[PDB]
Design a protein around this ligand. Structure first.
Ligand SMILES: Nc1ncnc2c1ncn2[C@@H]1O[C@H](COP(=O)(O)CP(=O)(O)OP(=O)(O)O)[C@@H](O)[C@H]1O
Ligand SMILES: [Mg+2]
Ligand SMILES: [Zn+2]
Ligand SMILES: [Zn+2]
Ligand SMILES: [Zn+2]
Lengths: 112, 97, 171, 178, 107, 271, 557, 84
DNA sequence: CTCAAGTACTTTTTCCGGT
RNA sequence: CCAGGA
DNA sequence: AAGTACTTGAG
């Protein structure tokens, strides 16, 4: 918890060194993201890219072919929840506009 | 023009879901394969016009679907296959969560 | 046999039909596709039961095209034959090879050899007949056949049937 | 697109085994005893004896003619003409299969009346025999317990020889005249 | 709890899991000289009951996985004698909300 | 790297901030559940000043011939004197304001009153004054109950989380905490009547607008906050290059930080 | 365009990774793939019934595919196969193959540690497929003996017999594409003192892997359905179809075969050599020679950039492009063909600022407007307008390029002998020129910002440059020293809405990056604004009247 | 499994994205000669027709808002507040 | 069996004519 | 690959 | 280059 506070303090100071102001929330998110696993998760292929996200998603950054080889070897199942995977699949990602579904109601249709 | 990763990124930031799908599909790559519902690969000998479907070595002349994926993805899957990796594409779930 | 079966069909409606006579267009498109149909999985889908209570559910609008997809849940009468099934039918055709028997929507063909020995072909009759010592089998005669095997053939199902064993043959 | 069921089973890569179907009462995956209706409830297999079947379709199309004429506001040889007319009214007409089925049923039905088919259905569904056997006992006219036990080879030890012969008596009595 | 001066032999340390359902804890006297919980940067952690946890997960529709984790070796996890699976509710002062509550599941 | 780490993160329909595993990153976006565009630097008056000058500004004492609201401030001014029942409300009020001050002083250790918060209250009051043509002479048609309770009610309508249970309602309470300190600070009885000179109607309109403006301010389930954060940290650093104690800083310190560099360049303590 | 298919259209909800069982490869295969020769049926320019279409995909563009009857843009490729004369390691699994041998007995195929060991039961407890394998390995790598009898889960005086086999285990080390062991031995208690040094054959590892129990291998990474360890060893090789390795077919009679088409023949040649060598008078060493060559060719076909240096280099010195290389980031599949693509309905030119444009508009040069096209559906609301644009043709500004029939077959207004007499029917599509007020995605790379890509109102103007309002300069980080910008035209009534409703320039005025406006008055306007507003600065009627008129929304007061 | 109407918790206000997707979807439908549930007061652009339908709350669409667990709350465009 | 130096791997901004 | 552009 | 992960060999 104190690691998170230190980490932010330290990040904020690089941005604020230049003078430039970045809203809390953005730094907080990054800081939180590295933190949540229980320790200091690097923003490298050794950090986030080795977490339990989808094979297609992780293969899109840094270790590629190697990631896909271990996918085949351990019979990995891609959830297909990540932006990246839907981009690779050419599907509407569950991002903003795609975060929900649209339905026609015959009830409302017959009312008008 | 190349609609780069950085460019994708802003569309993701805007939440322009359909817009991104259109750039990556409709207005580029966009292709149609026939996949098998048992061994989730591009195996299907879709003689569309004769309405014959088949996937010999599944003996599946029934459980077949069509999907719209970027041709580069069709390619990626065929490339991984050539390298012994099976990227099985499935049109339903099992895991839930 | 002849079953009532709970089935469901996904139909994709074009926006031009997003009028208030929608459920009606859907109920009919279902019948167009489903009714009369013949699959190996379910056999002959003959008649959709309970038209008044067909479950349309909510239609999901398909992203880049305008259309909406509905899984039309329903219940219908199906005919799915099996081997070992003893069926009563009427003769339809007759040759030196055997005779076809019409069993509901389906045809069961009885081989010259799938019949008892006594019963033999007779080309010299109108229409050609199978003449036994005491029996005669021709185009209008009613027969009781045992289905030996089935073949799922596109928009149909066919079968080879025996009349050689006990209690089978002409009725 | 084609029709789906209520049986969802995840056949993941594992293609086959597909055992033959028989009078070892070994019907399909789809035609097994423990079915599921759209209400999600476990329901039993619905097998019909041609007459139990004739009356279902007859009823269905009759009630379809009601719905059709509402939405449009703003003796055997004689039953055959009556039915072939109702088909032209409610069915696709392209559906030759139903026209054949309806005639076959009209000519091959063992019980003409709903009340008659009622008692058939009562008498039989008290044997514990499986929907198939129960329908086959309804659609096949048998005299010897043997005739029936030979044509429906599943029955084999499932019923008494005398009990089946007792049932065969009542089905012959119920048998509507033509 | 066992407060040791310098060390505990690899011999003695093998007798720690020996007596269940009862539990044992090792603590180097030197680490304890200053209380870490008192630090500016260390927020108010609270161990949740078996019922409280059940509610947390029900109330947010979570699997145990989805919860931000705390290491079992974590100084504060040791301080409270946190056991794997136990959740801590962390109350921090927020420059945005005034007070913000996070939760961490034990590792 | 910042984009690929955060890509999959967004606000869900429960205001929770989850990745593609549905793992909770932030329970509520940026601890407050507000969209950054809607935020503005506002001054939490209550934080600073002499304990003396705080009292002069906020305190109403209907039981003191000197510390009452003059009958020049409101119509009830005369009949309001010595009203024990109302002096109970004004006591709750002032005791809550003092609570607020001590709490804020815990959060903001140096007494920085200027913090970016949603709903610019200064503007709302300003706008009410020109909208209703506030007569800085004439006494208000407000009751102590009109102000005191009106504020207290608006507070219950500042909705970030909607759930009907203790966890969520206690989380809703928490999310709204700091905004309320500001709200109570700007809408205290003395402040409203003496400084703003708001009419009952003007006040009602101020309240409605705070409510509307607040609700508008909350983040939208679907907001792709992951990418947003990456670019918001990223973009500065990229221009901070492309354009025109001595501890490692800038681009290399940032590189040090994200990489979680063990052997760092200038390790320093501050005792 | 692609033709109608009766098959139900779906979305990929899950991707199930795994490995190819040789049996699957043979099952799915439409041909084997016997001759290194591409084609020329004895010089006769047509595909050989042996490599690259012995039923496979298709070439010629004319002439349909031999299996599906589709042809070129419809036919995906069709897979083939090569039965390898001897097993070979898949390059990618070489260390996982090693790490498995390290965990399992090299004789019985049992795990070197089991339920009986305490740290083992603790590690077997690990839920994570990767973390479990990690812990099993570090534990078993050191167990150099398969245990027959082991100390019981009580008193160690009475020893419980687990699985059988006593056998000493090798100390495996990799010698590039070869896995070699070193069994300690025993000889007068001392040994080693010179141990048993021998290479582990692909076939023996295979037979051990084959014997690894489901429960055993399933405790390691593996899944009994999709990926058994025996499938990390290649027996039957899939042959990718032409669409994967197309010939760059220059002139009529001339080849130009792909790098993979060569590498496959290389494999094919190495395989036939080995096959004949063993079937004939096997000179033993000559076999373990032609074997290791086929192991190389099968290795380098998938990954050419291997640690053990010799790059399989083309006769030209230049190295062969491995499949691994094709997918490696920034350029190449994932990063360069999928995460980013080259797009249609894109335009780019030199940008120059305009003080007479509105904040949200973008000056589009007539030539650019006349090229870019939006597909509009023939509806009764626009039927007449569209018929005029169609009359106008692809040369006039408010005009059209193509008309899309029900049939789906495009009518080129540029040539169509019926470009005049062309009667539009509802539900058709007219691809019309981009018009004043259409929403378009305007962008300036970098694109560090969400704001570096905003939606604008089209304004068709003369002169070859994209004109933008000066205040919109800042977000893009644009200037006019020779900067160029990109324009993207949405094609859906749906994507149009996405731009207009979410990413329009006026919506982006206040930035969440800093919780303040990201656009303001700049340069001339800022400089002049100071000058205009000093007390000192007064204006006579004549000018005041022109300044007043200039404000488009002035009340006339 | 679908949250009942009397158990819904999500914003009673329409998200920026929901509005955009609704307007897009209707425009795309209207454009494909779909039936219009409003008086076109001389309107010819389908986005403007959709804006009009949204204003009169005569759009027959439902937003299915999925929660991270998979469960969802169905909301009519008629029932959603439009403060955007 | 714990300890150290050594080797193994992986990457380094975005977009846009001539040999 | 080389030479350039913001 | 430059780092860090991973594996190696000496004490
Ligand atoms: N190599 C590069 N890579 C990426 N972006 C670049 C780039 N070079 C230039 N740019 C883009 O173009 C801008 C550079 O402007 P330049 O033409 O170099 C003059 P400057 O040094 O930025 O300002 P100045 O002329 O007032 O001294 C950058 O701020 C950036 O957004
Ligand atoms: Mg410039
Ligand atoms: Zn298949
Ligand atoms: Zn083909
Ligand atoms: Zn062994």
């Amino acid at each position: 918890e104190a690691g998170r506070a230190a980490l932010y303090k330290e990040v904020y100071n690089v941005i604020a060194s230049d003078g430039s102001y970045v809203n809390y929330r953005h730094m907080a998110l990054l800081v939180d993201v590295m933190t949540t696993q229980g320790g200091l998760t690097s923003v490298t292929r050794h950090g986030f890219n080795r977490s339990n996200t989808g094979a297609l998603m992780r293969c899109s950054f840094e270790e590629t072919v190697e990631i896909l080889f271990e996918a085949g070897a351990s019979a990995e199942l891609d959830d297909c929840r990540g932006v990246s995977e839907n981009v690779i699949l050419g599907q509407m990602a569950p991002i903003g506009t795609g975060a929900f579904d649209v339905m026609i109601d015959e009830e409302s249709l017959v009312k008008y | 023009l190349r609609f780069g990763e950085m460019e994708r990124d802003c569309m993701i930031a805007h939440g322009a879901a359909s817009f991104l799908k259109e750039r990556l599909m409709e207005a580029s790559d966009a292709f149609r394969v026939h996949i098998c519902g048992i061994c989730g690969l591009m195996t299907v000998i879709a003689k569309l016009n004769h309405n014959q479907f088949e996937c010999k070595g599944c003996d599946n002349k029934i459980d077949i679907y069509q999907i719209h994926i970027p041709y580069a993805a069709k390619l990626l899957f065929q490339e991984l296959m050539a390298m012994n990796i099976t990227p099985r594409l499935y049109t339903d779930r099992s895991r839930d969560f | 046999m002849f079953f009532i079966k709970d089935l469901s069909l996904n139909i994709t409606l074009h926006p031009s039909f997003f009028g208030p006579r929608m459920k009606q267009y859907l109920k009919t498109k279902l019948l167009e596709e489903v009714e009369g149909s013949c699959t190996g999985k379910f056999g002959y889908i003959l008649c959709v039961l309970d038209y008044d209570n067909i479950d349309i559910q909510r239609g999901r609008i398909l992203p880049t095209d305008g259309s909406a997809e509905f899984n039309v849940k329903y219940r219908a009468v199906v005919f799915k034959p099996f081997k070992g099934e003893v069926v009563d039918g009427t003769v339809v055709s007759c040759s030196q090879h055997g005779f076809e028997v019409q069993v509901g929507p389906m045809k069961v063909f009885v081989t010259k050899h799938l019949m008892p020995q006594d019963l033999t072909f007779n080309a010299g009759s109108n229409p050609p007949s199978y003449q036994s010592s005491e029996d005669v089998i021709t185009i209008k005669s009613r027969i009781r056949v045992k289905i030996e095997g089935c073949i799922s053939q596109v928009s149909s199902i066919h079968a080879i049937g025996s009349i050689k064993e006990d209690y089978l043959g002409a009725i | 697109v084609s029709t789906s069921t209520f049986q969802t089973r995840r056949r993941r890569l594992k293609k086959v085994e597909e055992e033959e179907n028989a009078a070892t009462l070994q019907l399909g995956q789809e035609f097994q005893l423990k079915q599921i209706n759209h209400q999600g409830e476990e329901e039993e297999l619905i097998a019909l004896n041609l007459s139990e079947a004739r009356l279902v379709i007859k009823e269905a199309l009759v009630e379809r003619r009601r719905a059709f004429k509402r939405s449009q506001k703003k003796t055997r040889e004689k039953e055959l003409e009556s039915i072939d007319v109702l088909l032209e009214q409610t069915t696709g007409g392209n559906n030759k299969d139903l026209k054949n089925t309806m005639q076959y049923l009209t000519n091959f039905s063992r019980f003409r009346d709903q009340e008659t088919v009622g008692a058939v259905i009562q008498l039989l569904k008290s044997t514990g025999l499986h929907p198939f056997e129960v329908a086959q006992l309804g659609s096949l006219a048998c005299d010897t317990a043997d005739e029936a036990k030979t044509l429906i080879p599943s029955l084999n030890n499932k019923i008494s020889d005398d009990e089946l012969e007792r049932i065969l008596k009542e089905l012959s009595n119920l048998e509507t005249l033509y | 709890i066992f407060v040791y001066q310098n060390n505990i032999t690899p011999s003695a340390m093998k007798l720690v899991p020996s007596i269940p359902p009862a539990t044992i804890e090792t603590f180097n006297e030197a680490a304890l000289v200053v209380n870490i919980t008192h630090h500016e940067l260390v927020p108010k952690h609270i161990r949740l009951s078996s019922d409280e946890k059940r509610e947390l997960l029900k109330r947010y529709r979570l699997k145990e996985s989805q919860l931000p984790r705390i290491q079992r070796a974590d100084p504060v996890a040791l301080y409270l004698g946190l056991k794997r699976g136990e959740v801590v509710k962390i109350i921090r002062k927020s420059e945005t909300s005034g007070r913000y509550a996070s939760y961490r599941i034990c590792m | 790297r910042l984009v690929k780490a955060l890509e999959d993160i967004m606000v869900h329909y429960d205001n929770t901030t989850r990745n593609s595993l549905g793992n909770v990153i932030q329970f509520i976006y940026g601890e407050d559940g507000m969209d950054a565009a809607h935020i503005e630097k506002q001054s939490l008056d209550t934080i600073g000043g002499s304990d003396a000058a705080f009292e002069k500004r906020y305190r109403v004492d209907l039981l003191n011939t000197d510390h009452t609201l003059d009958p020049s401030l409101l119509e009830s001014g005369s009949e309001i004197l010595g009203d024990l029942k109302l002096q109970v409300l004004l006591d709750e009020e002032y005791k809550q304001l003092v609570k607020d001050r001590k709490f804020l002083r815990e959060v903001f250790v140096d007494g920085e009153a200027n913090w970016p918060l949603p709903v610019n209250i200064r503007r709302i009051i300003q706008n009410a004054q020109q909208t209703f043509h506030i007569d800085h002479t004439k006494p208000s048609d407000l009751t102590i109950k009109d102000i005191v309770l009106g504020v207290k009610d608006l507070q219950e309508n500042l909705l970030v989380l909607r759930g009907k249970n203790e966890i969520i309602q206690n989380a809703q309470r928490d999310a709204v905490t700091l905004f309320c300190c500001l709200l109570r600070s700007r809408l205290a009885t003395r402040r409203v009547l003496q400084e703003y000179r708001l009419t009952k109607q003007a006040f009602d309109w101020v309240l409605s607008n705070i409510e509307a403006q607040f609700l508008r301010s909350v983040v939208h389930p679907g907001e792709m906050v992951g990418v947003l954060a990456a670019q918001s940290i990223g973009e500065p650093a990229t221009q901070m290059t492309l354009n025109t104690k001595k501890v490692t800083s800038g681009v290399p310190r940032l590189k040090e930080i994200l990489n979680v560099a063990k052997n760092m360049k200038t390790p320093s303590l501050t005792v | 365009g692609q033709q109608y298919s009766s098959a139900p259209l779906r979305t990929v909800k899950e991707v199930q990774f795994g490995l190819f069982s040789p049996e699957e490869v043979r099952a799915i295969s439409v041909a084997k793939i016997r001759f290194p020769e591409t084609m020329d049926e004895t010089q006769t320019r047509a595909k050989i019934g042996g490599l690259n279409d012995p039923r496979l995909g298709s070439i010629d563009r004319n002439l349909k595919c031999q299996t599906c009857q589709e042809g070129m843009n419809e036919c995906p490729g069709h897979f083939g196969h090569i039965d390898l004369a001897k097993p070979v390691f898949h390059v990618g699994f070489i260390a996982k193959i090693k790490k498995v041998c390290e965990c399992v007995c090299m004789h019985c195929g049992k795990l070197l540690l089991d339920e009986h060991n305490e740290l083992m039961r603790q590690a077997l407890a690990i839920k994570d497929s990767k973390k479990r394998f990690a812990a099993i390995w570090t534990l078993c790598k050191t167990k150099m003996v398969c245990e027959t009898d082991v100390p019981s889960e009580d008193d160690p005086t009475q020893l419980v017999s687990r699985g059988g086999c006593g056998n000493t285990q090798p100390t495996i080390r990799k010698d590039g594409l070869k896995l070699v062991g070193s069994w300690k031995k025993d000889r007068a208690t001392g040994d080693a003192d010179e141990p048993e040094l021998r290479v582990l054959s692909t076939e023996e590892i295979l037979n051990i892997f084959k014997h690894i129990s489901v429960k055993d291998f399933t405790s390691l990474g593996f899944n009994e359905v999709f990926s058994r360890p025996e499938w990390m060893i290649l027996t039957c090789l899939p042959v990718p179809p032409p669409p994967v390795r197309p010939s760059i077919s220059f002139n009529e009679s001339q080849r130009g075969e792909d790098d993979l088409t060569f590498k496959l023949a290389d494999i094919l040649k190495a395989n036939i050599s080995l096959e004949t060598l063993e079937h004939n008078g096997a000179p033993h060493h000559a076999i373990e020679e032609a074997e290791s060559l086929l192991q190389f060719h099968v290795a380098t076909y998938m990954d050419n950039d291997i640690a053990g240096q010799p790059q399989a280099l083309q006769k030209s010195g230049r190295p062969v492009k491995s499949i691994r290389a094709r997918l490696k980031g920034k350029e190449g599949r994932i990063r360069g063909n999928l995460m980013g693509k080259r797009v249609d309905f894109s335009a780019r030119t030199v940008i120059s600022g305009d003080p007479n444009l509105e904040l949200d508009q973008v000056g589009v040069p007539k030539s650019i407007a006349k090229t870019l096209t939006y597909p509009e559906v023939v509806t009764p609301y626009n039927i007449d307008r569209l018929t005029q644009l169609v009359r106008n043709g692809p040369n006039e500004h408010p005009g059209a390029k193509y008309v899309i029939r029900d049939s789906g077959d495009r009518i080129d207004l540029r040539y169509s002998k019926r470009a005049g007499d062309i009667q539009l029917q509802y539900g058709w599509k007219v691809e019309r020129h981009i018009m004043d007020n259409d929403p378009v995605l305007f962008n300036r790379q970098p694109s560090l910002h969400k704001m570096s890509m905003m939606a604008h109102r089209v304004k068709v103007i003369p002169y070859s440059t994209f004109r933008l309002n000066l205040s919109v300069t800042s977000p893009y980080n644009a200037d006019f020293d020779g900067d160029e910008m990109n324009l993207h035209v949405p094609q859906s009534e749906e994507t149009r809405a996405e731009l207009s409703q979410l990413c329009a320039v006026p919506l982006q005025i206040v930035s969440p990056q800093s919780n303040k406006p990201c656009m303001g008055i700049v340069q001339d306007t800022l400089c002049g604004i100071r000058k205009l507003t000093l007390r000192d600065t007064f204006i006579e009627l004549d000018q005041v009247l022109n300044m007043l008129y200039w404000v488009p929304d002035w009340d006339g007061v | 499994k679908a949250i009942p109407k009397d158990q819904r918790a999500t914003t009673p206000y329409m998200t920026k994205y929901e509005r955009a997707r609704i307007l897009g979807t209707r425009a795309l439908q209207i454009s494909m000669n779909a039936p219009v549930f409003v008086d076109l007061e001389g309107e010819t652009d389908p986005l403007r027709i959709a804006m009009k339908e949204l204003a009169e709350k005569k759009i027959p669409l439902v937003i299915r808002r999925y929660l991270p667990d998979g469960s969802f709350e169905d909301w009519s465009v008629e029932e959603l507040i439009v403060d955007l």
